Design a protein around this nucleic acid. Structure first.
Ligand SMILES: [Mg+2]
Ligand SMILES: [Mg+2]
Ligand SMILES: [Mg+2]
Ligand SMILES: [Mg+2]
Ligand SMILES: [Mg+2]
Ligand SMILES: [Mg+2]
Ligand SMILES: [Mg+2]
Ligand SMILES: [Mg+2]
Ligand SMILES: [Mg+2]
Ligand SMILES: [Mg+2]
Ligand SMILES: [Mg+2]
Ligand SMILES: [Mg+2]
Ligand SMILES: [Mg+2]
Ligand SMILES: [Mg+2]
Ligand SMILES: [Mg+2]
Ligand SMILES: [Mg+2]
Ligand SMILES: [Mg+2]
Ligand SMILES: [Mg+2]
Ligand SMILES: [Mg+2]
Ligand SMILES: [Mg+2]
Ligand SMILES: [Mg+2]
Ligand SMILES: [Mg+2]
Ligand SMILES: [Mg+2]
Ligand SMILES: [Mg+2]
Lengths: 83, 208, 127, 100, 116, 99, 151
RNA sequence: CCGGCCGGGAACUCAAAGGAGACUGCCAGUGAUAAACUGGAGGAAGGUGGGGAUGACGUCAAGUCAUCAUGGCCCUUACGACCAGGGCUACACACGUGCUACAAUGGCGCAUACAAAGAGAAGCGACCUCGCGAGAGCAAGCGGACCUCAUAAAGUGCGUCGUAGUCCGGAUUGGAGUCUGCAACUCGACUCCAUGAAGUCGGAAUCGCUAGUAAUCGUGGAUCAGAAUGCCACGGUGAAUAC
């Protein structure tokens, strides 16, 4: 995990996107390629469709997704089984 | 991949290094980059001149180059002209006050760099390859050579299957470490592919 | 007035001083029993001593460095025999038949390329 | 290697030499423990706007005569093949074959 | 010789026999007896009756046998139902900590299944 | 005391420079402390000699570095300055010092 | 080897008794290079080994070694149809080195709490003609007399 | 100041330049007056002293057009070029090479002896100060036989656990962390704490090794921001056996 004297990591653009989302008040799906940004508690109650290498898959952030990262809900491989 | 390069196993024994300079581990690679480019442009410029052994000896913030050659008469040009016209583009690459001196090489038939360049320029102009081998094998023995071996390698005569052929006269030891083995290699760029030349010349055994 | 010896082993080298006295023993400023914890290593420094009659004639003073338990103990042995001869020149014939005046020059063989050790080649399998 | 892999390398040395004292300042604002989180929130969002090729841990060592990204040696700058060729001629002072 | 809602063995020593509790190891049991004031090489049998009393007041502050089996089962089932990467690996029997699953995944998958 | 180190890759050209640097101030000065040798770094290497796939076929190289020491205890007026104008051969960096 | 012969190298006597063969049972007992923790099981062997016997410390071992010395062994010539197991008179050194190998072998295989207690339940019985090292002398001497036909 | 640190001393070790020595040369004996071989007086070394490098003519249309170079052909708003995320880390499964184990010749705790070879400037980073710890803070010392990396471990002294899936084994997952790094979800190493799998020496078959070898136990280095059970290098302990 990232150090705690450094603090959390987030992109500067997605922080401006979610702020502009809540201040305007939309439920539009925000598509962002920031799987490496940690979710902030203002992002709760929004649809933020984080990319998985192939497309954009939506994430509606509930409470328990704060200290996680956005890539954990956008699966990047695909697998059904061998036979 | 069977034979060692005969120069490298002789470098501490009877043969010198071409670059005798000091550095630390800081600036060793920057000097080594510096030494490669100044030999690279001196090859392209003096490819009509008979330069054989460029020696980069750089003591105390200046570079010195002894050009070993069969003729200074094109390497100097006019007396003090091409020694100076090449120097100002030698002090461009290195970054030190350059000094391109000259030591002349007599007897051009006894040089493995020049025999590599006197066979390749005949292979370049479509001669019969087996004649061009035999001039070098016979000319060294008149000039007092204890042994020669030449070899052309790869797509001889134009035919589709490549091969390799060689000749030998006198004696050329290789396992004797104290053998005065002159040895170098050239590159023939013909219309059907690449031909390679190797030449061994033995003079004697430099006693210790 | 003193007598000196030199001995060597694998990576060991000892400095043996000899004075006449009680038969007093000092090994790196320390006693015979304090230094060598191993009884076999306590023995092998006394191997020329039981060979000849000099367990009481001479004192022996040791400063050994480098090597190991049996390394330094074989370094001290070859040096005492060098000093048994540095005194007498007569005991050389019994010490030669003991094999004590010969430095056993078995040095450690280096690791080589394509090998896991000095001689252990890796596990070959044809398929 | 490719000409577009040597030229891709050169600007990574150029861009990282330009923004050296500016990327190093934003680390010491976070390497300071005894500073304010009204500054340690300003350093951590500012370093994303600096380019990715500005980081000194982004550029990769290559052989200086061919551009090979493996077999590297730092004392020569070259890969394993080109040190060997220049040794056997003699342009590397001291470098000969060893045996012990 | 009965500590913390289980039975702890009789003829084992002080710090060893406490490690039968789901929730202590060799280190945390040294924290029990150095705080309480008992030597560490006596058994749990022939401890006096004024000694087993206070020893659980050292144990009760830790999150132990029933209090610790539930929060691990609450932790893993919380990873299940969000849809995170970790819980996908907890509901598919494939390991979580980054390890290679091309070969040597023989703990989370069980021993070898033949092809049928 | 005045220190003079010499680092050189050649093993006889540094022996060729010590009867060059003593013979500059032996005339002018006295109590030259002497040509003290130091141990030798043997900086070794290993590469691969095949271009594609032969891991066991290799060459072991090395570069050895030679060290000496020339120590002048007290200079005269004419000791270091005659030594100062001189310049030694290639493959050597000298390190003159005081302290 | 096909060509030539080497003899022997010197084997250092001990600090303890002044024997060549005391160094030769610790070398068969030594595993993984440890002469320190092997020469001390041998020293803690002979203490309880002379105690039950009532003999000298070294002389009690030399009698337990006697009842396990092989005298006829079968080697393989294998020039006929199958392998012929041909019985041979044994040289006096292989009488001793095979015996010490069998006493070290049994003491690995017991279930006591020490090594020296697994060992002293074997060198006690090897002078008392029961155990496992005497089962190996008599299973070699069972194969050596069922092959007495061949010469 | 009980510590070569410090008068001083050039002995000894050690360092590294030059000379010395080993040649079946002197001894008997076998053999064709030969070449040679067997045993030996000597000697630090005996008969190729020990290790390395050194790979003849050619074989396999052996390997690499992706280190590089190059005949030919093919591509040219794309088979070229720049970017962000993803992938090279996937897993019903199959084989090759390793590390750790299955314990008492051992585990833990405590005291305590003994090395060699190496690297170091955008580098290694004493002591002091905190922190359960990896680390952090302040910050000397060294371009280095000066300074640091650096504490060798197996061993020995004492003490315990006494044959159980165990005070053996350490996988695996839960919650906390530290660090390098724009950035540790995919997909890093390390710390502390909780959990404590399989495993009790392995069918047929198969491999390495002739002496400082095997076995064993540590240690360095190169690639490198970080990331070695791999690769290369080093010493300590140190066998069995060859009719
Ligand atoms: Mg070769
Ligand atoms: Mg030869
Ligand atoms: Mg080893
Ligand atoms: Mg391999
Ligand atoms: Mg197989
Ligand atoms: Mg190109
Ligand atoms: Mg990199
Ligand atoms: Mg427990
Ligand atoms: Mg003799
Ligand atoms: Mg002899
Ligand atoms: Mg083919
Ligand atoms: Mg192929
Ligand atoms: Mg290809
Ligand atoms: Mg990319
Ligand atoms: Mg891969
Ligand atoms: Mg299999
Ligand atoms: Mg354990
Ligand atoms: Mg124990
Ligand atoms: Mg502390
Ligand atoms: Mg089980
Ligand atoms: Mg643990
Ligand atoms: Mg058992
Ligand atoms: Mg490293
Ligand atoms: Mg690293």
């Amino acid at each position: 995990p990232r150090s705690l004297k450094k603090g959390p990591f987030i992109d500067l653009h997605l922080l401006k996107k979610v702020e502009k989302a809540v201040e305007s008040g939309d439920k539009k799906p925000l598509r962002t390629w920031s799987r490496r940004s940690t979710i902030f508690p203002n992002m709760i109650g929004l649809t933020i469709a984080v990319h998985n290498g192939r497309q954009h898959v939506p994430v509606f952030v509930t409470d328990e997704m704060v200290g996680h990262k956005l890539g954990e809900f956008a699966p990047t491989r695909t697998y059904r089984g061998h036979a | 991949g069977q034979k060692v390069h005969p120069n490298g196993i002789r470098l501490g024994i009877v043969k010198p290094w071409n670059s005798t300079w000091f550095a630390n581990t800081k600036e060793f690679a920057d000097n080594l980059d510096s030494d490669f480019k100044v030999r690279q442009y001196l090859t392209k410029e003096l490819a009509k001149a008979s330069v054989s052994r460029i020696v980069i000896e750089r003591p105390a913030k200046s570079i010195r180059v002894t050009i070993h050659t069969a003729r200074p008469g094109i390497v100097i040009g006019k007396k003090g002209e091409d020694v100076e016209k090449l120097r100002k583009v030698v002090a461009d690459i290195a970054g030190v006050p350059a000094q391109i001196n000259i030591a002349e090489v007599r007897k051009p038939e006894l040089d493995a760099k020049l025999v590599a360049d006197s066979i390749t320029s005949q292979l370049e102009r479509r001669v019969m390859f087996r004649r061009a081998m035999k001039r070098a094998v016979q000319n060294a023995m008149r000039l007092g050579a204890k042994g020669i071996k030449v070899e052309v390698s790869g797509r001889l005569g134009g035919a589709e299957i490549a091969r390799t052929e060689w000749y030998r006269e006198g004696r050329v030891p290789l396992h004797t470490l104290r053998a005065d083995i002159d040895y170098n290699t050239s590159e023939a760029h013909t219309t059907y592919g690449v031909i390679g030349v190797k030449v061994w010349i033995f003079k004697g055994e430099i006693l210790g | 007035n003193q007598y000196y010896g030199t001995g060597r082993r694998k990576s060991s080298a000892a400095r043996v001083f000899i004075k006449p006295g009680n038969g007093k023993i000092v090994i790196n400023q320390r006693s015979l029993e304090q230094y060598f914890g191993r009884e076999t290593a306590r023995m092998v420094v006394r191997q020329p001593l039981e060979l000849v009659d000099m367990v009481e004639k001479l004192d022996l003073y040791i400063t050994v460095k480098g090597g190991g338990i049996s390394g330094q103990a074989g370094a001290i042995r070859h040096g005492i025999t060098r000093a048994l001869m540095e005194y007498d020149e007569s005991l050389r014939s019994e010490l030669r038949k003991a094999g004590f005046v010969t430095r056993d020059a078995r040095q450690v063989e280096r690791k080589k390329v394509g090998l896991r050790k000095a001689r252990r080649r890796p596990q070959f399998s044809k398929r | 290697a490719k000409q577009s892999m040597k030229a891709r390398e050169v600007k990574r040395v150029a861009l990282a030499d330009k923004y050296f004292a500016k990327r190093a300042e934003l680390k010491a604002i976070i390497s300071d423990v005894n500073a304010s989180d009204e500054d340690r929130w300003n350093a951590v969002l500012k370093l994303q706007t600096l380019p990715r090729d500005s980081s000194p841990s982004r550029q990769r060592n290559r052989c200086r005569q061919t551009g090979r990204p493996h077999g590297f040696l730092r004392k020569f700058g070259l890969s394993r093949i080109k040190v060997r060729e220049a040794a056997m001629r003699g342009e590397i002072p001291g470098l000969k074959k060893a045996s012990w | 010789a009965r500590i913390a809602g289980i039975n702890i063995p009789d003829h084992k020593h002080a710090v060893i026999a406490l490690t039968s509790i789901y929730g202590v190891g060799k280190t945390r049991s040294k924290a029990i007896l150095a705080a309480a004031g008992i030597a560490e090489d006596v058994k749990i049998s022939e401890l006096s009756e004024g000694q087993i009393d206070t020893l659980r007041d050292e144990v009760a502050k830790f999150v132990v046998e029933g209090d610790l089996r539930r929060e691990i089962s609450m932790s893993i089932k919380r990873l299940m139902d969000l849809g995170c990467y970790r819980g996908l690996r907890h509901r598919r029997g494939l390991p979580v900590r980054g390890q290679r699953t091309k070969t040597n995944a023989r703990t989370r998958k069980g021993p070898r299944k033949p092809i049928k | 005391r005045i220190r003079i180190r010499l680092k050189a890759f050649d093993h006889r050209l540094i022996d060729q420079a010590t009867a060059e640097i003593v013979e500059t101030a032996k005339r002018t000065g006295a109590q030259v402390r002497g040509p003290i040798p130091l141990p030798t770094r043997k900086e070794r290497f290993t590469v691969l000699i095949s271009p594609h796939v032969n891991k066991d076929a290799r060459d072991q190289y090395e570069i050895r570095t030679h060290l000496r020491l020339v120590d002048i205890v007290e200079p005269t007026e004419k000791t270091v300055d005659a030594l100062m104008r001189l310049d030694l051969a290639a493959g050597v960096d000298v390190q003159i010092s005081l302290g | 080897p096909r060509r030539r012969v080497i003899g022997q190298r010197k084997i250092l006597p001990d600090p303890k008794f002044g024997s060549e063969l005391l160094a030769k049972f610790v070398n068969i007992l030594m595993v993984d290079g440890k002469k320190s923790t092997a020469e001390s099981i041998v020293y803690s062997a002979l203490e309880t080994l002379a105690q039950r016997s009532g003999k000298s410390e070294l002389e009690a071992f030399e009698v337990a070694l006697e009842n396990v010395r092989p005298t006829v062994e079968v080697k393989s010539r294998r020039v006929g149809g199958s392998t012929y197991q041909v019985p041979v008179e044994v040289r006096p050194v292989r009488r001793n080195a095979l015996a010490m190998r069998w006493i070290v072998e049994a003491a690995r295989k017991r279930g006591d709490k020490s090594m020296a207690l697994r060992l002293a339940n074997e060198l006690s019985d090897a002078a008392e003609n029961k155990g496992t090292a005497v089962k190996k002398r008599e299973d070699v001497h069972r194969m050596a007399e069922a092959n007495k036909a061949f010469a």
